Amino acid sequence: VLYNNADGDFAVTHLTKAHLFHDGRVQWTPPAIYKSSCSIDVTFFPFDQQNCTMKFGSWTYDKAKIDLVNMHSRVDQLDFWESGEWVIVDAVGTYN
Amino acid sequence: ETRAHAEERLLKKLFSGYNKWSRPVANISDVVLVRFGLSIAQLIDVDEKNQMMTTNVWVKQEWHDYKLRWDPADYENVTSIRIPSELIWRPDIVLYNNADGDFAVTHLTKAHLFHDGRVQWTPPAIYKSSCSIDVTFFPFDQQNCTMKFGSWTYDKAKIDLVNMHSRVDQLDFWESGEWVIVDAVGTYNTRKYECCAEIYPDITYAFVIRRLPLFYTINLIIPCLLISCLTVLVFYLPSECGEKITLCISVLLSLTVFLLLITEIIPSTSLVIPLIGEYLLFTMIF
Amino acid sequence: ETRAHAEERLLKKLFSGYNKWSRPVANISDVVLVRFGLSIAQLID
Amino acid sequence: SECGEKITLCISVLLSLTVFLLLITEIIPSTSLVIPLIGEYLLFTMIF
Amino acid sequence: ETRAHAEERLLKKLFSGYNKWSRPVANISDVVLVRFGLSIAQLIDVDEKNQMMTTNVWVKQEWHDYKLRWDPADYENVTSIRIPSELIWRPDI
Amino acid sequence: TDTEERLVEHLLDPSRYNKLIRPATNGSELVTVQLMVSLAQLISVHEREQIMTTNVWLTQEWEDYRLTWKPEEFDNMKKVRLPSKHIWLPDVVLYNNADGMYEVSFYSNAVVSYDGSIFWLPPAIYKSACKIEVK
Amino acid sequence: WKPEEFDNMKKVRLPSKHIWLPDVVLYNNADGMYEVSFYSNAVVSYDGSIFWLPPAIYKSACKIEVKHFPFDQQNCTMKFRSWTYDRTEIDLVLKSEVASLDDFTPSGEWDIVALPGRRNENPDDSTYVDITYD
Ligand SMILES: *[C@@H]1O[C@H](CO)[C@@H](O)[C@H](O)[C@H]1NC(C)=O
Ligand SMILES: *[C@@H]1O[C@H](CO)[C@@H](O)[C@H](O)[C@H]1NC(C)=O
Ligand SMILES: *[C@@H]1O[C@H](CO)[C@@H](O)[C@H](O)[C@H]1NC(C)=O
Ligand SMILES: *[C@@H]1O[C@H](CO)[C@@H](O)[C@H](O)[C@H]1NC(C)=O
Ligand SMILES: *[C@@H]1O[C@H](CO)[C@@H](O)[C@H](O)[C@H]1NC(C)=O
Ligand SMILES: *[C@@H]1O[C@H](CO)[C@@H](O)[C@H](O)[C@H]1NC(C)=O
Ligand SMILES: *[C@@H]1O[C@H](CO)[C@@H](O)[C@H](O)[C@H]1NC(C)=O
Ligand SMILES: CC(=O)OCC[N+](C)(C)C
Ligand SMILES: CC(=O)OCC[N+](C)(C)C
Numbered sequence: 001v002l003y004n005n006a007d008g009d010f011a012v013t014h015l016t017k018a019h020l021f022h023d024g025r026v027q028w029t030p031p032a033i034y035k036s037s038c039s040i041d042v043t044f045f046p047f048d049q050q051n052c053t054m055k056f057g058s059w060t061y062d063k064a065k066i067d068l069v070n071m072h073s074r075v076d077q078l079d080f081w082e083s084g085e086w087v088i089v090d091a092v093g094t095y096n
Numbered sequence: 097e098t099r100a101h102a103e104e105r106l107l108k109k110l111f112s113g114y115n116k117w118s119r120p121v122a123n124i125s126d127v128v129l130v131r132f133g134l135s136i137a138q139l140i141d142v143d144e145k146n147q148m149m150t151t152n153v154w155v156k157q158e159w160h161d162y163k164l165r166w167d168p169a170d171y172e173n174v175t176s177i178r179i180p181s182e183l184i185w186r187p188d189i190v191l192y193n194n195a196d197g198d199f200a201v202t203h204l205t206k207a208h209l210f211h212d213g214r215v216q217w218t219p220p221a222i223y224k225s226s227c228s229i230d231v232t233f234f235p236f237d238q239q240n241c242t243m244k245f246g247s248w249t250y251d252k253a254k255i256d257l258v259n260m261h262s263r264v265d266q267l268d269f270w271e272s273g274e275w276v277i278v279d280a281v282g283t284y285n286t287r288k289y290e291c292c293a294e295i296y297p298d299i300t301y302a303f304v305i306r307r308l309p310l311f312y313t314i315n316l317i318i319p320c321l322l323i324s325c326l327t328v329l330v331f332y333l334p335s336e337c338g339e340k341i342t343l344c345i346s347v348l349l350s351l352t353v354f355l356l357l358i359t360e361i362i363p364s365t366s367l368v369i370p371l372i373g374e375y376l377l378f379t380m381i382f
Numbered sequence: 383e384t385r386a387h388a389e390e391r392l393l394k395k396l397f398s399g400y401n402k403w404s405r406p407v408a409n410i411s412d413v414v415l416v417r418f419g420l421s422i423a424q425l426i427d
Numbered sequence: 428s429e430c431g432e433k434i435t436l437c438i439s440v441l442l443s444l445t446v447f448l449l450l451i452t453e454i455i456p457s458t459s460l461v462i463p464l465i466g467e468y469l470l471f472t473m474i475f
Numbered sequence: 476e477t478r479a480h481a482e483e484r485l486l487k488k489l490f491s492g493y494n495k496w497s498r499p500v501a502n503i504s505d506v507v508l509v510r511f512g513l514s515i516a517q518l519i520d521v522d523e524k525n526q527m528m529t530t531n532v533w534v535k536q537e538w539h540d541y542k543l544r545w546d547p548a549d550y551e552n553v554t555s556i557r558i559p560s561e562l563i564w565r566p567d568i
Numbered sequence: 569t570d571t572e573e574r575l576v577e578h579l580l581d582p583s584r585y586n587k588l589i590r591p592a593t594n595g596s597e598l599v600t601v602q603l604m605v606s607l608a609q610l611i612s613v614h615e616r617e618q619i620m621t622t623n624v625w626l627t628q629e630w631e632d633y634r635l636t637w638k639p640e641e642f643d644n645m646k647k648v649r650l651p652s653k654h655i656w657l658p659d660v661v662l663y664n665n666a667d668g669m670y671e672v673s674f675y676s677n678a679v680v681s682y683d684g685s686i687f688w689l690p691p692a693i694y695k696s697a698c699k700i701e702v703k
Numbered sequence: 704w705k706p707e708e709f710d711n712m713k714k715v716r717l718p719s720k721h722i723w724l725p726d727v728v729l730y731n732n733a734d735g736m737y738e739v740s741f742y743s744n745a746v747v748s749y750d751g752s753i754f755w756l757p758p759a760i761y762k763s764a765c766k767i768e769v770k771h772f773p774f775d776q777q778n779c780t781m782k783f784r785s786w787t788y789d790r791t792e793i794d795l796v797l798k799s800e801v802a803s804l805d806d807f808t809p810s811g812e813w814d815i816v817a818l819p820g821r822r823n824e825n826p827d828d829s830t831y832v833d834i835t836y837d
Contacts, residue, residue, distance in 0.1 A: 001205075001220075003137075004137075004138070004270065005152065005220075005222075006138065006140050006152065007140060007150070007222065010203060010220055011203075014737070016726075016786055016787065017726070017787045029421075031423065031735070031737070031786075033426070033735040037138060037140070037270060039271075039272075039273070040455075040456045040458070041461055042455045042456065042461065042463045043461045043462070043463060043464060044463075044464060045454075045455060045463045045464075045465060046465075054420075056418065056420075058416075059205050059206070059220075060178050060205055060206040060207075060208065061178065061405075061414075063413075064413065065178075065405060065413060065414065066405075066413065066414045066416055067413050067414070067415055067416070068416055068417075068418045069415050069416065069417045069418065070417075070418065070419070071417045071418055071419035072419050075419075075420045075421065075422050076419065076420065076421035076422070077421075077422055078421070079421060079423055080422055080423070080424065081423060081424035081731070081764060082766075083424065083425050084766070086425055088422075088425070091422065093418075093419075093420065098408060098409050098410065099405065099407055099409060099410035099412070100404055100405060100406055100407050100408060100409075102410065103404050103405060103410075104401045104404040107401060107403055107404055108401070115573040115576060115577065117573075117576050117580075117650065117651055117654075118569070118572045118573040118576050119569075119572065119649075121569060122569065123569060124569050124571070124572065124643060124645065146612065172410055173410075174410070178405075179403065180403055183403075188676060188677065190674060190676075190691065192608075193609070193623075194623065194673075194691075194693065195609070195611045195621075195623065195693070196611070196621075196693065197693075198673070199673055199674040199691055200674055226609060226611060226623075248674070248676045248677075248691075249649055249676050249677040249679065250649070272458065273456070273458030273459055273460040273461075274456070274457050274458050274459065290606075291606075291625070291627065291689055292679075308458075308459030308460075309459070310459035310462075311457050311458060311459050312457070314462065314466065314470060315448065315449075315452045315466070318470065318474075319445050319448065319449075319470075319473065322441075322473060322474065323445075333434075337428075337431060337434070338431050339431060339433070339434035339435065342434055342435055342438065343434050343438065346438045346442065350442060350445070357449070424733075424764065426733075477592070477593050477594075478590075478592040478593070478595060478596060478597070479589050479590065479591055479592055479593070479634065482589045482590070482592075483586050483589055486586065486588065486589070496716075496717065496718055496721075498716075503710065503712065517697065519666075526811075531668070551595075552596065557588075557590075558588065559588065567743060567744065
């Protein structure tokens, strides 16, 4: 679930079909619309560069039962749709 | 020997003949002591015009269930498991002063069950409660918004609330830059309603929040004062200049606009009048 | 023989006694390693 | 001074600056930790 | 004897082999006549800028089901009952 | 308790209790439902939209003879809490509502006495349309 | 089924929620609604051909060009994909090269110019297939 949710959904609500392989591996890639709160710095507006974060973690399973492995560090942008108002300088996930 | 077999073995045993519609007490006269606490995640909104407060909280609950007990020695030394919250009896703690929100917890995350029957449930929630707004000293105002929690259908003789801790946890509070929590304490209360002949306990949390008065001072106060400074200059202006009326008319139409802008921020309550509203109005009269 | 029949048989076998409420780990000491990643579709607002 | 338009010009400038400040206020968050440079510049210009 | 008991017996009998996915006509060539009507409750809004009309209506429908018939004399004179609309075939208007 | 769980299973046992059937007795009779609105707060009265939002408790009381039991046989239990979604309810709704939400907000439990009396007091946030006088 | 064994019935209506569906969705939707809005019945022929025509209100993201406002022309696209099966499982095909306007209601503010449809593959992926209407 998204820890810093704000007025949105805590957990994914679309629940697509999971791809299950014969060796037990499961791949589940559902979509989600997330409204995450982030601190806005407008000192240099309109030439500002915001730094908004999204915190993901298991709600009820501790590190001794579920451990998250950072598949890749940076957020995948292969299917990104250009907004025309913002440019993603760098999106990196940090394991804490 | 294995967990996904032992834990599965344990899960099957627990939910064999479990009834989720019955208060979990071995004796009728017993009381289900629910330890209730709040951990605020952030203060999403403090809307003054609508007199409502939106918050993100973790509704810490904890109670004993006598049917969900086992001996860890029998199950490969499993001391605790995570179980669905929709399969077990839960207290119906609702937010009494709900305005434009949900009365109960609607997310139903998993609960942590310990071998002695203790059940820990910490579901997240977004509560939109109603609180009286006093804007007498706006923008230096200090609000006091309260959230009332209690069981809805069980009286004090069946379910009783225990203050987990007096103060609302704030370790993970998200600072917004507009509001600062001065204190947030839950107070235990009991009272009788005309509905029912039994005492219904409740825990009320009082969030005393203080606004940081530098945005509205920079953006409303100083611009208001600067225009008020021009109120008197019309009397030093020579009549031959032919600009006296232009100066004072412009001042009047500016102060009027500022009053309406403030009118759209403060609540429409008619009990108290803001000091800023009084000052603007009196300047407009003069 | 057809793939649909084989898949029906496989689904019947897999979910015969599957309990979704239990952690899927072979052993007590095991930990479910969940590989996590985000792909951004669009920055809405 | 004989033109009889100094007051009109300066008052118009003042009110235009105030309106633009109010427009800015409808975009930026109501936070008290940082202040935009555009806002500071507008406020200093209004004071002068 | 009690009306509730008779209604329970009737409900058990009616939905014994009822299919809600099939058109309720004794013959394929038959046509289901669905008397359709509207009862406006309030004209909520008329959005000129967006060119939409919001209305609050009661969509009165009425048809005939040949498999939901019974004799009231055999069920303590029960002439009608209220059943969830999701247990019976409905027109997809 | 074991006795309370047994009573709950016995009362709502679907083989003997059908929640879709009105609890009519003595023949073609009607079930008398008592109403009482308790106003908890007047949240807002929008004049532009002509909608009044209220926080009310909608007391509802009726008699369900099918939920009767003998206290002697159940450890002298006089009343039990049943989930309102699993018993017959009179579908009492805010008919003149705005925003198209007819039913209550929470669906609390129903306090059932041993003599079949039912007591349901669900909370609700109601948005009702009303005619605003501007004169 | 064999019509002769079922009173010579050639086609029947079955609920679309109780038969296998290709989870074709509006991939580039802008409000998070992927599926169709109604989930009507599917007309099934006796030979196994399924014909499903559900209605839908869609909100797709568009790249609005403002250089020539108010004499501007917009090129908004709708990309359809199956968010469950890849190209090795189901192959999407175009029934026609253009969208149908047989039951179209003229807008009044916007004039329709062209509604072509194209089936796109990825030569580098081989598991990607979509149909885009411009
Ligand atoms: C963005 O914020 C995160 C956490 O607040 C920090 O670790 C990171 O260095 C920041 N990046 C920039 C470019 O400011
Ligand atoms: C689980 O792992 C522990 C430590 O690796 C081992 O002692 C135990 O025998 C294992 N259990 C099974 C059922 O393999
Ligand atoms: C329940 O508690 C009461 C009071 O402590 C006691 O009199 C009664 O015997 C208890 N019930 C049982 C079954 O032990
Ligand atoms: C059971 O587990 C606990 C910790 O969960 C440990 O302290 C204890 O030694 C274990 N006992 C046995 C017999 O494995
Ligand atoms: C806040 O409100 C509560 C109840 O309205 C009251 O008991 C408490 O004293 C108030 N605190 C302050 C600091 O005003
Ligand atoms: C159904 O109607 C058609 C036309 O009226 C008729 O030929 C046919 O015999 C009818 N079916 C039965 C079973 O009577
Ligand atoms: C059955 O009920 C109807 C009214 O619903 C009444 O007119 C009729 O007399 C009743 N018949 C019997 C046999 O009770
Ligand atoms: C056990 C449990 O549900 O904990 C929830 C709190 N959190 C998300 C900080 C771990
Ligand atoms: C019995 C019951 O439902 O009571 C609801 C009202 N309350 C919380 C004031 C007792």
